[PDB]
Amino acid sequence: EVQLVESGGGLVQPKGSLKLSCAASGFTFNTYAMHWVRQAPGKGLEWVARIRSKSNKYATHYADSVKDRFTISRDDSQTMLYLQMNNLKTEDTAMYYCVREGSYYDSSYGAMDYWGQGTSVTVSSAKTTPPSVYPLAPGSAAQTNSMVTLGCLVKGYFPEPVTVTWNSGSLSSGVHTFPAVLESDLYTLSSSVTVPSSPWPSETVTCNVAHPASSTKVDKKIVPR
Amino acid sequence: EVQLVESGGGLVQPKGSLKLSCAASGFTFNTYAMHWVRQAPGKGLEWVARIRSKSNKYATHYADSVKDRFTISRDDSQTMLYLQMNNLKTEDTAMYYCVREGSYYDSSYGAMDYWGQGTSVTVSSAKTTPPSVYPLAPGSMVTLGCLVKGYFPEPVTVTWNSGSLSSGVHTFPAVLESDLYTLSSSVTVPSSPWPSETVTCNVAHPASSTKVDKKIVPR
Amino acid sequence: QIVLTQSPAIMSASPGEKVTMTCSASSSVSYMYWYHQKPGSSPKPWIYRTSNLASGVPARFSGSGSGTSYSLSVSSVEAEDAATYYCQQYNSHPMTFGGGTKLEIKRADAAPTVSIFPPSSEQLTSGGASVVCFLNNFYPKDINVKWKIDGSERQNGVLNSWTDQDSKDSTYSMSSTLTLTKDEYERHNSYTCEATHKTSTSPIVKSFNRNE
Amino acid sequence: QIVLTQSPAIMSASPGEKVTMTCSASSSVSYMYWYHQKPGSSPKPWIYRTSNLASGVPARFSGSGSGTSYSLSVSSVEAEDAATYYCQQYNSHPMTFGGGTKLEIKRADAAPTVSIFPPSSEQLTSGGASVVCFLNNFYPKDINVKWKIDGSERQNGVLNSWTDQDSKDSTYSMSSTLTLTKDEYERHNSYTCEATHKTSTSPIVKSFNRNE
Amino acid sequence: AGELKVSTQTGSVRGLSLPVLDGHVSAFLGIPFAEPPLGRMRFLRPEPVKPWQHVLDATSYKPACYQMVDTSYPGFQGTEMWNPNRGMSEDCLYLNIWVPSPRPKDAPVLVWIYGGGFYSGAASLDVYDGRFLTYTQNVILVSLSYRVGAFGFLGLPGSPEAPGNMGLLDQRLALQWIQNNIHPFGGNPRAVTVFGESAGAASVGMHLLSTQSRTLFQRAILQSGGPNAPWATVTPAESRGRAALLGKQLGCHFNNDSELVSCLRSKNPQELIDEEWSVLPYKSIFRFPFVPVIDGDFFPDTPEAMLSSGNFKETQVLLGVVKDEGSYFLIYGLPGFSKDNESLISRADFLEGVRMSVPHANDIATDAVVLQYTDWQDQDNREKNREALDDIVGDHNVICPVVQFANDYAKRNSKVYAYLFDHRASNLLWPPWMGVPHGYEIEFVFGLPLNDSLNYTPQEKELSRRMMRYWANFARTGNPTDPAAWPTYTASQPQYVQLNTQPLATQPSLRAQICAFWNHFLPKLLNAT
Amino acid sequence: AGELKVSTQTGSVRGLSLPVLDGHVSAFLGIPFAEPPLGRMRFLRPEPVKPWQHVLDATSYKPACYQMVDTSYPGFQGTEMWNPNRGMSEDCLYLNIWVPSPRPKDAPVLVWIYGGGFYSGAASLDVYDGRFLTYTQNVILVSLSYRVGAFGFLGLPGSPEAPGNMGLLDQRLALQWIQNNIHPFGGNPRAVTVFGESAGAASVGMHLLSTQSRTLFQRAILQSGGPNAPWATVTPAESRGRAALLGKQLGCHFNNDSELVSCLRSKNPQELIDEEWSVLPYKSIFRFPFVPVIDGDFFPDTPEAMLSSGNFKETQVLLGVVKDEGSYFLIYGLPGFSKDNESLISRADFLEGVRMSVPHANDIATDAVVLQYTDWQDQDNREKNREALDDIVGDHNVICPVVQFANDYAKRNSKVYAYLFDHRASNLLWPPWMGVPHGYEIEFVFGLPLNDSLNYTPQEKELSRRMMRYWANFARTGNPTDPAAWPTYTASQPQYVQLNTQPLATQPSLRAQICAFWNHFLPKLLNAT
Ligand SMILES: *[C@@H]1O[C@H](CO[C@@H]2O[C@@H](C)[C@@H](O)[C@@H](O)[C@@H]2O)[C@@H](O[C@@H]2O[C@H](CO)[C@@H](O[C@@H]3O[C@H](CO[C@H]4O[C@H](CO)[C@@H](O)[C@H](O)[C@@H]4O)[C@@H](O)[C@H](O[C@H]4O[C@H](CO)[C@@H](O)[C@H](O)[C@@H]4O)[C@@H]3O)[C@H](O)[C@H]2NC(C)=O)[C@H](O)[C@H]1NC(C)=O
Ligand SMILES: *[C@@H]1O[C@H](CO)[C@@H](O)[C@H](O)[C@H]1NC(C)=O
């Protein structure tokens, strides 16, 4: 199975430097042309750079807005792709995808046939703030039967991203994790979960929130009031 | 005194060869440009060829009617000029003068300032015939003479009293009729010296290697 | 810079309807590649070299085009087709992508399930007070939300957030958070979360009282 | 081939007269050179580079000219000046010479001194017979000679010869030789040498008789 | 159909009827002319095809020979039109045939030898489809395939395990097959014109030189190529050094000469391709790794020496070039060059570009190339530097070898016809700076403008129709003109014609002054240093 | 007189009044500026003239320095105009001066350095008479004389008996004299503009370059010559080899270096001249035996090295050429050439003519000269071969050194002004093929067309008047025009003007492409072989 795992992302001050990594598996890496593609929040896709195989003399091509600041490199022995980013600008704030291009051998020839989940890069002068995770339980016992809406608020964190799951991922249905909102260099996020009146509070409902930037892992049990 | 003496001339058959010589004296030969100039009988002058000094790399220039058939040469150690003539033609029949050109140093710069007496060249298929020299005596002044009849080719030398009789002499130009030349010379002397004093015409035709002295005798 | 123009930016179709998305290139290109993108996921290959469907893409999808004009079609649209579709050219450097087309699938109008939540003890003990309101699983997307504190409207300190359409139930959901000081929150009783949506001719309201 | 044209071909002037010879060049030349030529002698340099007289040339001589037109002059002509004058150019190869100008000096008309000579014994014993006639020291040059054998005119076997003008006495001389067979000569008596010249209104005749 | 059935000396064959304009044609694709060079048969001479029973499906093109594919722009026809369109395999020795309808008796036969610098190419390319030539000119179009890369040209002269010119021996084997089997298709083996572009034209020239190939055809066309081209041939000592380095790059252990081939015969075809270009001795352009080698049998000496001495098949030749021969190659290495920008290269870049174009050259020879191609009044002009490199690359590698070929051919009293394709397509996919680039005459020769699905001007249809006639008239006559327009080429009168959307115009000199530099002086310089 | 009396730092001078057109000028001729180099003073440095008492007759030109005289056509001005007109002697160190009437106060001073390839020349030539420039341009015209041949340049560097550049020292001594004595003649020594043709211009350039000889003038004119010309300078080792061979040719017996000079000082002046050309190492043209030698003092290195590094006097320069520079030199050696025929030379003759033009060249350098000057479409054209040699000889020896000088001079922001004299005389004595030959601009510069005894067109009078103004205006302003249009020359913009019977027209490149061959590539070639 083909996998692409980005790392190295985070908060960098403007004019600063960062180096992204990409762990590739499930294919003959050395025979493939690799790419870095970025997506600013709420925006489309912007190609960053390409690096061809050793046969195509490791030929690198760059997007003009990036041409002598960024550097694409690969280490075929470790099946790794890298993006060295120097003199970072507020404009570079985006999700960076490590993407594979289909070879002549594939039906996908020329396409971006595998994209990694991404590594978030935030170029700001603002500082790292951990989130405060609060439970949202119903105060007034309204319609019981049939469904219950619980949720949890992830307040005042910087930068993005924040991971939110319910019941360590086993609670998928009835979940709505809303996109984060910035107000005065601090993000706020919320996640709601609907379960029947029968499983709650009889069965444990917990929101697992992770903010790796501030190195924060919190599990909040939604408890009745 | 400057002197130029040509030799080598004479009768050559057509398509034949001849080499003219020229003895030069009285000047620094090696520093002078030398020339060969020709004059057909009764005609004007035609330049043949030039040879410059050793400093001007013995540079030779020829008249087109002669280019590659004639060759002009030098031998400065012997003060000699030469003209090697090959594939001779009837047109080449002429008197050939060896001429000196005046150097930048002379008033005569560029001019043919010295010409030799010449060497006669006759290009013909006809043969060498010696002349028959006959006296002409009559049958205040006396006219005697002598006829030089039926010779080939030209020239013929005629003198009176081995040169001591100069005045009163008329040696007429030769006339060709059927490839044979005839010439006459008259001499006027007073009635007193003849026949009392010997009158002799000395005729020379070097081609046939002929030398004749004829005493004009009364009859 | 070959500029790819996708139109419409947002497309709305009922289930079973034929739909065509276009991609217009500033300069002629040899082929067009298409990708789809779903919320919280990276793009996925959809169409290879103008018209070749990617492994796993349903047959109802088709690609076509020439020179400067390219298109993606769906013969009979389903709820699972709710995504953003981008076109890409690999004719000239830099390889470029279009702005995308948000494909939205129509469905029966659905009223929102509104839930209000007072500030948690832990937030109050930390000095702050946030009131949360969720307005979940509604259609159409067009919704407006207002807050009232003891009858008077409140606009300052409100952070609104909206999800993209759900592929499974064709619905939209919203969140709204009123942030106040613990001091200000403890000076009032009524906290009201009021919504306006197609499904009702009167405001859809939820409320709580600090003294309850 | 620069062609030099001398004119007149023959010039006649009285002693003391100013005379000018011209030389016309087919193409323009930088300088002209002149030489004089006397009978039985090779040419001698006369004028150097248009105007400079050669060593020993009398002051009465001058040269001049430019481009294509050059000339040689004598202020006061003398008998000594009887010769042929040639012009030469040494501007281009081949160096060329003009046709020449025969300068003849006029003088008082002089009748010819005619002498007839029978065939020598020497000639007769060899089988042939030539009768010689000299017509010496006459002016002008224009003379005609006829032979008569026993009163009848004879033209066959006659060889005529003429000298150029003498520099010392301005005269001309002629020779005429009637040649027949010994057999033919022995068949006749009268041998007559008859001349026509300006100086006489009647033929000038000399004769001999085999029987005298 | 009926018509679509053909029985030959090697077996029977299944056809296909194909519509063209107001009529039809017949096509027979995938006819083998050899055994597959697989396992222990890889790098060997081509074994002639063992006759089959009964009917063979010749309705589909077969795959191209394993090659390095150009993946620089996967979504661009400009590069993609030259890449394999029906896959790659070692089993690739097949020929294709297009016949007019109704099947003729003794019609002319045009054999296409594709280019790709001996490392690439395919007879199945859309640009080499014989449909329009066979319908508008009533000729028989054949296209052969030949082994490329180390597979076709691993050169260890003397050794039977890798003779050295296997690709040329595949070409030859197909030519031998056409002779023994083209009459059942309605063509005459005695009337065969061999034509090709780039390495294809070099290959055509290599068949006018080697004796054993001479007897297999009548005439020849050489399009944008010559056998005496600098990139076309190799020294037996170099081809050996190249083969050994391949082994070392692939981690081989060998003592004997055949010990090296055994190790390579095991390595996967892509493993080999991935190392094939590392053998080249310099940083260069227009230089290919495995190419024809002067062995002593196929090549008894160099094509230069052979053309000079005049030992070639004395026949008539159609030759020619495009306006911008070099432009395509510049963008594959030379600093500052791209099809995606104006390629306004600096004086610094121009100089390194000269060094990459004459790679075997010493400093004095590089100085000579710089002298001829510099405007000494405007040295730092980036547009002139661009144009100058396009000229160095075009002249050195394409135009000047062609001129030497034409001069040496006419020196032996052979009729030679010269063209210049200088019409740029109204719909060309390349940037303006690249002009009329290398290989873009082919689409006109093969009749592609006549296709309404391809968007060409009516003026482009006219020129294609004309070029097809010229090519066909030459293939039949040995003179491409007919109404009584195109004169012969001599070294004394090096006349050539302009092929464009204008009446055939004549031009007096086909780069004689400059090619005197490349052909006479530049070698002389190296013989002295 | 009045103006015919002048008293100077060295003595008193008696003049001569000369009528010119509607007025007159004053001339002072035969003014010594040095002691006679006779007996033991022959081959030595020039000793400055010992002041005299009382008045010196400066009413007649003095004789020219002993030289080889051109006797090829004694009755032709074409050659004779260049020969000594007032005799030859070792006592020849005299300057001639032409002053306007009435005598000015601080008028411009033009100093003429005559050509003749350092083996010939005279200030007394009719073509260098200053009458017209003095009268029409109200300028002072001075003409110096300098030793030539072995007498002026017998090179034995280090030895005081023959210091090598004796001729350029004579020139210098005259320049030193002009400074100390031209104001009593009514001139300004602050406005001394030096000018010369061929070796004269090489001399001018050798004064812009050498050390104690650059303060002696303000401006410079180089006409059909440059100091960096191949025939202009010699290696100290060659000049020595040349001097020794002279001794051996003259039957000398010498061990020491000064033992040589003693033997030569005895030999008659004509004895030496008659052997002077036998020293040359090759069969050549435009190569002179005794020429300036790079010693270490006068020349601290080569003029090429000096112009390149910038070791020279930075000042305004007027330069230029004639349409046919080479044509005069062809008829003095090259096979098949004459002024008395069309000189339609064969390919055989053309090749030997190339070998005589680049004599120090090896086979590869000869091949390079043949490559540039051959029409590879029409090789056997006798008219092109003739034109080609005229170009090789003109470019190698005259035009290309001038362009290197002009490029190296503007490589300092110096205002350099370039011309091309291309009007051929209505009354020129040379054949048509020779065009506008070497040295025939001089008669226009010196005003000869204004003389009614000389037969020139009224259109020729206009151009002479104009050239005299340009020369004068440059000597005055440093810009040969007056604002109310002749541009500067740089290595970047190599513009030049046409001097003819048509309004000053401008041309963009003065042989930049070809001179890049001669100046950049041809030396490089020899440094590699
Ligand atoms: C016109 O396009 C030219 C082609 O460029 C490609 O296409 C465009 C559209 C882009 O996608 C571009 O990224 C592509 O490269 C373009 O020429 C290029 O110019 C850049 C500089 O701007 C060159 O980059 C430098 O490359 C070297 C490595 O080069 C190797 O490959 C080339 C291939 O030809 C060889 O010639 C070389 O010898 C090498 O083997 C890098 O070392 C160098 O370093 C930079 O980064 C390091 C840190 O990693 C720093 O230390 C340095 O300071 C530098 O910042 C550069 O990356 C590029 O090689 C060159 N391409 C070619 C093919 O020549 C040209 O500039 C365009 N015009 C304009 C106006 O943009
Ligand atoms: C290959 O080399 C081995 C020795 O290393 C030897 O046994 C073998 O026979 C050689 N084969 C040939 C063909 O030379």
Tab-separated table of C-alpha atoms in Angstrom, chain E residues 206-398:
chain	number	residue	atom	x	y	z
E	206	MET	CA	24.406	3.638	-42.884
E	207	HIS	CA	22.482	1.426	-45.445
E	208	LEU	CA	23.993	3.326	-48.445
E	209	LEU	CA	27.481	2.667	-46.927
E	210	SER	CA	27.545	-0.954	-45.621
E	211	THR	CA	27.723	-3.379	-48.633
E	212	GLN	CA	25.294	-6.129	-47.398
E	213	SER	CA	22.463	-3.535	-46.886
E	214	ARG	CA	23.110	-1.830	-50.321
E	215	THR	CA	21.324	-4.548	-52.384
E	216	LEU	CA	18.081	-4.167	-50.333
E	217	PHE	CA	16.614	-0.857	-51.794
E	218	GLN	CA	16.494	1.502	-54.837
E	219	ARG	CA	16.608	5.144	-53.528
E	220	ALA	CA	16.885	7.077	-50.240
E	221	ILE	CA	15.642	10.208	-48.409
E	222	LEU	CA	17.618	11.690	-45.438
E	223	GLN	CA	15.489	14.176	-43.405
E	224	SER	CA	17.359	16.378	-40.860
E	225	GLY	CA	20.204	13.814	-40.544
E	226	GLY	CA	23.329	12.204	-42.074
E	227	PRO	CA	25.477	9.095	-41.195
E	228	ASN	CA	28.604	11.320	-40.834
E	229	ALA	CA	26.904	13.321	-37.996
E	230	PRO	CA	29.072	13.716	-34.872
E	231	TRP	CA	26.496	11.977	-32.559
E	232	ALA	CA	25.799	9.116	-35.088
E	233	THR	CA	28.946	6.939	-34.813
E	234	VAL	CA	31.443	5.671	-32.145
E	235	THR	CA	35.074	4.488	-31.903
E	236	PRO	CA	35.267	0.751	-31.042
E	237	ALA	CA	37.463	1.698	-28.031
E	238	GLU	CA	34.763	4.162	-26.759
E	239	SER	CA	31.785	1.715	-27.301
E	240	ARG	CA	33.782	-0.811	-25.234
E	241	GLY	CA	34.516	1.748	-22.449
E	242	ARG	CA	30.750	2.538	-22.503
E	243	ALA	CA	29.670	-1.135	-22.271
E	244	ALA	CA	32.110	-1.785	-19.324
E	245	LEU	CA	30.943	1.299	-17.359
E	246	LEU	CA	27.311	0.048	-17.768
E	247	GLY	CA	28.407	-3.229	-16.101
E	248	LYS	CA	30.240	-1.337	-13.264
E	249	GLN	CA	27.176	1.006	-12.725
E	250	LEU	CA	24.952	-2.085	-12.499
E	251	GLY	CA	27.378	-3.677	-9.962
E	252	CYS	CA	28.723	-6.334	-12.378
E	253	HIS	CA	31.836	-8.449	-11.713
E	254	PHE	CA	33.572	-9.540	-14.945
E	255	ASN	CA	36.975	-10.647	-16.325
E	256	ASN	CA	36.201	-11.976	-19.882
E	257	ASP	CA	34.426	-9.904	-22.592
E	258	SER	CA	31.423	-12.356	-22.737
E	259	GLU	CA	31.409	-12.470	-18.864
E	260	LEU	CA	30.245	-8.784	-18.995
E	261	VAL	CA	27.324	-9.533	-21.465
E	262	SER	CA	26.051	-12.519	-19.298
E	263	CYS	CA	25.744	-10.155	-16.245
E	264	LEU	CA	23.808	-7.548	-18.323
E	265	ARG	CA	21.447	-10.172	-19.911
E	266	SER	CA	20.149	-10.805	-16.311
E	267	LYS	CA	19.538	-7.154	-15.264
E	268	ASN	CA	15.857	-5.954	-15.710
E	269	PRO	CA	15.295	-3.764	-18.862
E	270	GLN	CA	14.475	-0.617	-16.746
E	271	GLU	CA	17.547	-1.213	-14.445
E	272	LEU	CA	19.717	-0.912	-17.578
E	273	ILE	CA	17.884	2.156	-19.040
E	274	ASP	CA	18.203	3.940	-15.613
E	275	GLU	CA	22.076	3.693	-15.922
E	276	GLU	CA	22.442	4.018	-19.767
E	277	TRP	CA	23.142	7.778	-19.813
E	278	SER	CA	25.829	7.696	-17.042
E	279	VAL	CA	28.261	6.175	-19.641
E	280	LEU	CA	28.552	9.439	-21.692
E	281	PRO	CA	32.029	10.971	-21.207
E	282	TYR	CA	31.026	14.688	-21.064
E	283	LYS	CA	28.303	17.196	-19.954
E	284	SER	CA	26.740	17.473	-23.423
E	285	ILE	CA	23.672	17.832	-25.668
E	286	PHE	CA	22.896	15.954	-28.922
E	287	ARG	CA	25.151	13.085	-27.722
E	288	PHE	CA	23.606	9.630	-27.359
E	289	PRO	CA	25.086	6.739	-25.233
E	290	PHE	CA	24.608	3.538	-27.346
E	291	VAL	CA	24.933	4.326	-31.049
E	292	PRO	CA	26.394	2.575	-34.186
E	293	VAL	CA	30.047	1.452	-33.752
E	294	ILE	CA	32.764	1.245	-36.449
E	295	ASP	CA	33.567	-2.499	-36.003
E	296	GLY	CA	35.440	-3.474	-39.229
E	297	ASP	CA	32.690	-5.502	-41.010
E	298	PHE	CA	29.416	-3.428	-40.948
E	299	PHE	CA	31.617	-0.312	-40.889
E	300	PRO	CA	34.973	-1.056	-42.636
E	301	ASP	CA	36.011	2.557	-41.674
E	302	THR	CA	34.193	5.786	-40.659
E	303	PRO	CA	31.218	7.111	-42.719
E	304	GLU	CA	33.339	10.321	-43.153
E	305	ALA	CA	36.220	8.269	-44.680
E	306	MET	CA	33.689	6.175	-46.744
E	307	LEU	CA	31.773	9.222	-48.150
E	308	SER	CA	35.118	10.904	-48.908
E	309	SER	CA	36.620	7.852	-50.743
E	310	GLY	CA	33.193	7.391	-52.388
E	311	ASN	CA	32.345	3.782	-51.430
E	312	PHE	CA	28.661	4.048	-51.094
E	313	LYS	CA	25.678	2.804	-53.100
E	314	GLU	CA	25.655	5.189	-56.083
E	315	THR	CA	21.972	6.166	-56.375
E	316	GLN	CA	19.961	9.493	-56.190
E	317	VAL	CA	19.164	11.132	-52.784
E	318	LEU	CA	16.571	13.593	-51.424
E	319	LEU	CA	17.975	15.490	-48.413
E	320	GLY	CA	16.960	18.540	-46.385
E	321	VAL	CA	16.622	20.448	-43.074
E	322	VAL	CA	14.127	22.563	-40.926
E	323	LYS	CA	14.671	26.294	-40.195
E	324	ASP	CA	15.444	25.670	-36.447
E	325	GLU	CA	17.190	22.304	-36.174
E	326	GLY	CA	18.790	23.064	-32.826
E	327	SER	CA	16.099	24.696	-30.726
E	328	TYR	CA	14.540	21.456	-29.482
E	329	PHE	CA	17.808	20.202	-28.063
E	330	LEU	CA	18.782	23.356	-26.252
E	331	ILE	CA	16.007	22.888	-23.583
E	332	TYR	CA	17.443	19.471	-22.567
E	333	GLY	CA	20.574	20.685	-20.755
E	334	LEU	CA	21.905	24.093	-21.845
E	335	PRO	CA	21.885	26.643	-19.012
E	336	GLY	CA	19.052	29.184	-19.015
E	337	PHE	CA	16.962	27.441	-21.686
E	338	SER	CA	13.265	26.620	-21.423
E	339	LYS	CA	10.230	26.321	-23.734
E	340	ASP	CA	8.457	28.109	-20.854
E	341	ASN	CA	10.435	31.349	-21.149
E	342	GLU	CA	12.206	33.463	-23.797
E	343	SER	CA	15.585	31.654	-23.112
E	344	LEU	CA	17.425	35.046	-23.142
E	345	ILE	CA	20.718	33.523	-21.979
E	346	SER	CA	23.714	35.560	-20.711
E	347	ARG	CA	27.190	35.643	-22.265
E	348	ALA	CA	28.253	33.381	-19.335
E	349	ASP	CA	25.490	30.844	-20.236
E	350	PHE	CA	26.235	31.108	-23.972
E	351	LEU	CA	29.859	30.095	-23.375
E	352	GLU	CA	28.971	27.016	-21.259
E	353	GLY	CA	26.398	26.185	-23.962
E	354	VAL	CA	29.208	26.205	-26.589
E	355	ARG	CA	31.349	23.883	-24.369
E	356	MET	CA	28.299	21.462	-24.102
E	357	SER	CA	27.736	21.556	-27.922
E	358	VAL	CA	31.404	20.782	-28.965
E	359	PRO	CA	32.245	18.544	-25.901
E	360	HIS	CA	35.366	16.826	-27.304
E	361	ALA	CA	36.765	20.285	-28.180
E	362	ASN	CA	39.892	21.840	-26.603
E	363	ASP	CA	40.042	25.562	-25.771
E	364	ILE	CA	41.350	26.620	-29.210
E	365	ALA	CA	38.485	24.781	-31.057
E	366	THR	CA	35.919	26.341	-28.614
E	367	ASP	CA	37.500	29.777	-29.415
E	368	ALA	CA	36.916	29.099	-33.144
E	369	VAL	CA	33.213	28.243	-32.564
E	370	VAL	CA	32.873	31.416	-30.408
E	371	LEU	CA	34.588	33.563	-33.181
E	372	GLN	CA	32.103	32.514	-35.973
E	373	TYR	CA	28.936	32.777	-33.840
E	374	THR	CA	29.654	36.067	-32.029
E	375	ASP	CA	28.511	39.509	-33.191
E	376	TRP	CA	31.666	41.442	-32.247
E	377	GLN	CA	29.655	44.738	-32.375
E	378	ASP	CA	26.882	43.443	-29.960
E	379	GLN	CA	28.424	40.666	-27.799
E	380	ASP	CA	26.084	40.868	-24.802
E	381	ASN	CA	22.732	40.594	-26.738
E	382	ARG	CA	20.729	37.764	-25.049
E	383	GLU	CA	18.507	37.305	-28.186
E	384	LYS	CA	21.610	36.912	-30.434
E	385	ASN	CA	23.258	34.451	-27.939
E	386	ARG	CA	20.010	32.370	-28.032
E	387	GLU	CA	19.931	32.459	-31.862
E	388	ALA	CA	23.708	31.689	-32.035
E	389	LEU	CA	23.372	28.451	-29.901
E	390	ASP	CA	20.355	27.320	-31.974
E	391	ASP	CA	22.699	27.762	-34.989
E	392	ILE	CA	25.804	25.996	-33.403
E	393	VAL	CA	23.684	22.956	-32.422
E	394	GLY	CA	21.783	22.893	-35.740
E	395	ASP	CA	24.907	23.356	-37.893
E	396	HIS	CA	27.323	21.041	-35.994
E	397	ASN	CA	24.899	18.109	-35.522
E	398	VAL	CA	22.413	18.375	-38.380
